[PDB]
Design a protein around this ligand. Structure first.
Ligand SMILES: Nc1ncnc2c1ncn2[C@@H]1O[C@@H]2COP(=O)(O)O[C@H]2[C@H]1O
Ligand SMILES: Nc1ncnc2c1ncn2[C@@H]1O[C@@H]2COP(=O)(O)O[C@H]2[C@H]1O
Lengths: 197, 199
DNA sequence: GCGAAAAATGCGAT
DNA sequence: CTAGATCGCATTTTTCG
DNA sequence: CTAGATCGCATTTTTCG
DNA sequence: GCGAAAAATGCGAT
């Protein structure tokens, strides 16, 4: 619709399965717009480990956190999860775009409000829950949002235990030791591809 | 300027220290703008624990995360830390003050801008750092906000060991038990209040 | 600027 | 193995009439 | 106490030409 | 739409 004026005012780039869409700490002067696919958002800790703050997808503005005050630079890594096509465009341009139309400012603004929410619940989650109850939370959230292939008795996921650990905050060998517990209990199913029965 | 206009249509109220401005859960439909004083945004889980996602001062907007979708709930309690002056409009109303002047829709979104970058880091200090690290990062965090009186060396923050905990996630005990030595380490000294960078 | 009362802290071996 | 979490109510420490 | 973390490497599983 | 190659897993006494 309105978001139609934008799409054809930006570019279409190509990034394969693993390219790092944007890197931490590098003066933000352009916002991406995932056309097809899904990137993942991550910050890391001195010793090297990563944590997956979020999983953006098909139609989510990216790297916006700075279109509002020059002098800023990245705050997280974004590496394409699948095959992603990103709609590139500078901040200034995009800016003079808003003066033409307002509506388009009223879109991501939301996007960045829905995240401010979720993330609060991640702190709500990381501090009010022990790893078990957190893996349960994270499986549901992945049984939700797209890509979760339907299955006979529920939704199906495709994620590595090593990976769960990152969204959550625990170690490789607990995520998987928990999944077995859940497995045994009959809450889900497991095999490199888990089903959240 | 582009705000006196914004306050033009904006019933304004004076809330007293410690008053609940907003309930986490309640149906959301009104915006707010703090023209004086300051609040604190906090979440709390059923067994009774609480957390401080942040403190909000003058110029800050509050309860604006339901402003984009019809039918959200207020995502967290907000309680005046002092006596505030708060202006309100009403969602439906705001949306109109936008079409006619989309600028007032900017300032706000550049706020959340930051708020997201910030609350984001909360998540990262929490899963990455130890209670200590998170106190060291908390002391400085506060040591530089609208209320840090200048001490000959560094400055004088004013806080209780329990606020810290709420901001950190650990206990009333472990905080001090963890503050004593951080003091013996000789970077700061406490006693009812604390001074950052030697005292 | 003095109190009584309301709050905020400290203990530690599990 | 290690970081923190805890509980009953005695104390400093703070608030404001 | 009690929830979680580690490490070196045989197996398994999943990925990529 | 096979297979070597490259990643993810499972173990526990501490
Ligand atoms: N908590 C979050 N939830 C979702 N997306 C985020 C979050 N934090 C950062 N990002 C995204 O990651 C991007 C990294 O670059 P920017 O800081 O430009 O903008 C950031 C956002 O688009
Ligand atoms: N993570 C956060 N950081 C700062 N403020 C927040 C956060 N989460 C919620 N809030 C604020 O608290 C308000 C609670 O109600 P709303 O969701 O309407 O709007 C929310 C924001 O104004």
């Amino acid at each position: 619709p309105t978001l139609e004026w934008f799409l054809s005012h930006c570019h279409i780039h190509k990034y394969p399965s693993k390219s790092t869409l944007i890197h931490q700490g590098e003066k933000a002067e352009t916002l991406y717009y995932i056309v097809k696919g899904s990137v993942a958002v991550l910050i890391k800790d001195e010793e090297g480990k990563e944590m997956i703050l979020s999983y953006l997808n098909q139609g989510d503005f990216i790297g916006e956190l700075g279109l509002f005050e020059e002098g800023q630079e990245r705050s997280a890594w974004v590496r394409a999860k699948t095959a992603c096509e990103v709609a590139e465009i500078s901040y200034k341009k995009f800016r003079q775009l808003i003066q033409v139309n307002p509506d388009i400012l009223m879109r991501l603004s939301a996007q960045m409000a829905r995240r401010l929410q979720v993330t609060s619940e991640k702190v709500g989650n990381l501090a009010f829950l022990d790893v078990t109850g957190r893996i349960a939370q994270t499986l549901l959230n992945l049984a939700k949002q797209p890509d979760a292939m339907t299955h006979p008795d529920g939704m199906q996921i495709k994620i590595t235990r090593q990976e769960i650990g990152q969204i959550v905050g625990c170690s490789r060998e607990t995520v998987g030791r928990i999944l077995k517990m859940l497995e045994d209990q009959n809450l889900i199913s497991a095999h490199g591809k888990t089903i959240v029965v």
